[PDB]
Design a protein around this ligand. Structure first.
Ligand SMILES: Nc1ncnc2c1ncn2[C@@H]1O[C@H](COP(=O)(O)OP(=O)(O)O)[C@@H](O)[C@H]1O
Lengths: 481, 238
């Protein structure tokens, strides 16, 4: 039964896309917020399809009403919620479902004061007794941004989704859009894809029953502490973290899942920023988090390094069997040439082992790792070598020279000798620990190869996740060679 | 054959009840919800509730007549004024939706001013013959055949090129995506009543009154199109 729900939602959003090109990220986000009781905000120049989305989502239901109003600098609350006689609210907002408010950053003082009580309590005063509002989707579009010290920030901090729409850029998607014969006032949604009033009241209760895995909480708490240490990062209140869970739990509900999926954290790119300056900062921190700690990308990097450290520890003890030797070409030529290991290392970053350890850069080292595509520069052009230590850090400057017997003698601050060698061409202890970590990569990759069919996930994000999973798998298969 | 007039002057203290008929449910006997061609002079000074009701009668052709709504047989929407609105006001929502921006001026020619100064033609008679007036059936049929006009590949090469040229110029005005979609309906209708089945390249001349917004951008839109029509239209500069 839960698996058939994701197919019905995919057919509902397909009919809503017919008529608006390059707006899939705006329609899918408004459909999920409408079925969960959340809001949505749009920003951009007037004329990028901002009012039609408010009149298009009403056709996906069976008892929805539209309300397209423009807030002006001289607007009165009696013209929005209906004039009083006790208030004639026949087709306005207290009895409507999907309302549209354009240019919300200029209404009267009493207009904004009544909109705050209709969100947290879903109610509206009417003289004496109060009544509930069957509001399902709240959308608001504008153009500019409000002031930094004004009363309009009370509503902006409460809205969840902050959509960033813009004009068209692609040429292929503009041909059919320029000459479109699809009407914007018909009913393109079939009668079989429209939910009833009973199914909506039942779905609002099953969203809160979604469990929260322990691994998902490690990503939300880490993102909160990362943005607090960055001065340029925008401040996120505690209300935004609580309201964002309802959005992630609703995405996995209509996708055939019962728990919070780690892939649902992509939607947080439009629920944290507030201006054009913080737009590039939120999308940058999430891209690193989704490609670092989501499916345990970096989590296996700190664990694989301990296996390589234990493997190289047993190889440097018996490094006296085979050392390194550079040729002494001459005949009819001047200075000799220096190179490194040939096909024995099939990687861009080769490793080297030393016999007597030394203290380089005020720290101990057990293995020196150089770049295969960069070591030939110093060995041919001369100057100062630039290589990292222990496989981490940047390319530090070492004191390497040539010996009379052709040996990479790494000199230090005490003029000590250290001949570099190469590891032997797999112990049983290292192989047993490597298969345990390699099996963890297949379990994390199997989860991504099952929930990638989520409709509420953009397509451009799947390219960076797949490139991050293959990078970790290509490194763990090197030690087993 | 069934058109009505409505000449009203919007003032700074105008009320929506004096425009859409006073309520009793609203007595809309000859006003706007049942009219066809309405005239609105000095539209840049009406009340806040007047502009809000005009936006719903354009994209939906409907009106909030109390409880149940009804359609408006509005065929032509004309508006005239004198001054220009503010740069950060609510009046720019209606200006961005209007397609044609006619720029009329006083007469300059001397030959055309002789008969105009002493004209005996009445402005309240019926100079249109009864055989040249279309019926109500032909109007509903023509609204569907306009969208069936094909778009040649050579025409799309000039529309996309003009859009990218105005985006690089800082002094060029910004044109929204709604203006590009609504302009095609005007060009397709010009070739429909001219004996053509496709979009003609000569129909791009009418775009000189659908892109500018003030007097500063008036000399820039008419200059880029003049070079485009005499450069890349019939492969002049090509
Ligand atoms: N980027 C776009 N793609 C497709 N259609 C569009 C686009 N922008 C506007 N439109 C069309 O223009 C019409 C009017 O849009 P409108 O409500 O004025 O947009 P906004 O509210 O952003 O000003 C809509 O029916 C819509 O189909």
């Amino acid at each position: 039964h839960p698996h058939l729900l994701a197919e019905r939602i995919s057919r509902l959003s397909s009919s809503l896309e017919k008529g608006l090109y390059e707006r899939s990220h705006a329609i899918r986000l408004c459909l999920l917020a409408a079925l969960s009781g959340e809001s949505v905000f749009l920003l951009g120049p007037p004329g990028i399809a901002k009012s039609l989305i408010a009149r298009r989502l009403k056709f996906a239901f069976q008892n929805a009403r539209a309300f397209e109003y423009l807030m002006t600098r001289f607007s009165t609350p009696e013209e929005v919620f209906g004039p009083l006689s006790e208030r004639l609210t026949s087709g306005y907002l207290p009895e409507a479902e999907i309302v549209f408010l354009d240019e919300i950053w200029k209404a009267g003082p009493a207009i904004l004061n009544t909109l705050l009580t209709a969100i947290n309590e879903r109610q509206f005063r009417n003289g004496a007794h109060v009544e509930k509002i069957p509001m399902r989707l709240l959308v608001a579009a504008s153009n500019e941004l409000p002031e930094a010290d004004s009363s309009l920030e009370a509503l902006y901090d409460r809205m969840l989704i902050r959509l960033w729409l813009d004009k068209v850029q692609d040429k292929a998607n503009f041909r059919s859009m320029l000459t479109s014969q699809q009407d914007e006032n018909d009913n393109p949604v079939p009668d079989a894809l429209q939910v009833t009033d009973e199914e909506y009241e039942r779905w609002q209760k099953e969203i809160g029953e979604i469990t929260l895995p322990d691994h998902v909480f490690e990503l939300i708490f880490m993102l909160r502490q990362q943005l607090d240490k960055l001065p340029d990062a925008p401040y996120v209140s505690d209300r935004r973290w609580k309201k964002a869970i309802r959005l992630l739990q609703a995405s996995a509900f209509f996708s055939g899942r019962s728990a919070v999926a780690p892939v649902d954290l992509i939607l947080l790119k439009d629920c944290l920023w507030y201006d054009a300056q913080s737009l590039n900062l939120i999308q940058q921190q999430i891209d690193v988090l989704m490609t670092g700690h989501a499916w345990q990308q970096q989590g296996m990097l700190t664990r694989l390094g301990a296996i390589v450290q234990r493997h190289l520890q047993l190889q440097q003890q018996q490094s006296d069997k085979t050392a390194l030797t550079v040729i002494r070409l001459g005949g009819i030529f001047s200075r000799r040439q220096q190179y490194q290991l040939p096909v024995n290392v099939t990687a861009s970053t080769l490793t080297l082992l030393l016999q007597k350890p030394l203290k380089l850069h005020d720290m101990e080292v057990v293995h020196i790792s150089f770049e295969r595509s960069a070591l030939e520069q110093w060995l041919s052009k001369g100057g100062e070598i630039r290589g990292k230590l222990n496989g981490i850090g940047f390319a530090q400057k070492l004191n390497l020279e040539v010996d009379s017997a052709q040996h990479l003698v790494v000199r230090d601050v005490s003029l000590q000798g250290s001949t570099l060698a190469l590891p032997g061409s797999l112990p049983g202890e290292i192989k047993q620990q490597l298969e345990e970590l390699e099996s963890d990569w297949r379990k994390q990759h199997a989860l991504f190869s099952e929930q990638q069919k989520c409709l509420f996930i953009p397509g451009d994000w799947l390219g960076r996740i797949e490139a991050s999973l293959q990078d970790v798998g290509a490194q763990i298969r090197q030690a087993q060679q």
